[PDB]
Design a protein around this nucleic acid. Structure first.
Length: 188
RNA sequence: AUUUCAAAGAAUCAUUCUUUUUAAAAUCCGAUUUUGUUACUUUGAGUAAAUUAGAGUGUUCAAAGCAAACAGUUAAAGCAU
């Protein structure tokens, strides 16, 4: 039934807890979850704990097609309901193929731009911020050659109370995904 | 303009050189090893001597040359029994 329906990965408790929360929204029939949670499929989940230690954050991988068609459409409303159920800070991202064309893979006349490492990381950066929208990107090159990605977000979600912990969370998630340093900001 | 960023360790003087690992496809016993072409570059292979650079070597020195050196008044010694 429900665990097998939701979870792509083999049976696991915390993944099952997210599935349970989505099911809890689906059973109850909350007002603004449009056409239910019910076609959401969980690929896998990871748990990340930030240095500043304000709760813990869950990253959720979703199959690309489900994520674009279902998750992206409703995403702010869906995340807030899931956040309300969930005891920890959740972010949903699309799983994406990464490969190099010098390996000369079987089904490819040239690797698509969508499957390029840089494009994938930019696309994932879009996915994590998603309820808020990127104004601009800037890469600061430290004297010792360390590189810091300064990401400016919108002015709409600036006036939320949860901002800096969320910015820390975005920075944390992107670092866990790829070991670049981030900084995030909101307009003066 | 454009397409795979990096990370951590070990060696070593705050420096430096290095190793490990981070998608995908094919293969071999869940682990193990392969993946455009050319220019460019690295090593190599094979490559007349004389000349040339250059080592060894006091031709009376040097230009040269390719020789020489050692000990023995004819034995010490080495090796054949």
């Amino acid at each position: 039934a429900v665990q097998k329906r939701v979870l792509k990965s083999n049976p696991s408790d915390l993944e099952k807890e997210i599935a349970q929360c989505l099911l809890d929204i689906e059973l109850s029939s909350s007002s603004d979850i449009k056409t239910d949670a019910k076609e959401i499929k969980l690929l896998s989940c990871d748990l990340i704990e930030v240095e500043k230690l304000k709760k813990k954050t869950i990253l959720i991988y979703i199959p690309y097609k489900i994520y674009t068609t279902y998750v992206r459409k409703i995403q702010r409303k869906l995340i807030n309901e899931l956040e309300k159920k969930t005891k920890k800070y959740v972010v949903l991202v699309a799983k994406r193929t990464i490969l190099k064309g010098k390996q000369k893979n079987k089904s490819f006349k040239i690797i698509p731009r969508s499957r390029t490492l840089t494009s994938v990381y930019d696309s994932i950066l879009e996915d994590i911020v998603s309820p808020s929208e990127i104004i601009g990107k800037r890469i600061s090159m430290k004297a010792d050659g360390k590189r810091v990605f300064k990401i400016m977000l919108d002015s709409k979600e600036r006036q939320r109370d949860n901002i800096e912990e969320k910015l820390i969370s975005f920075a944390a998630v992107y670092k866990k995904i790829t070991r670049r340093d981030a900084v995030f900001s909101l307009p003066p």
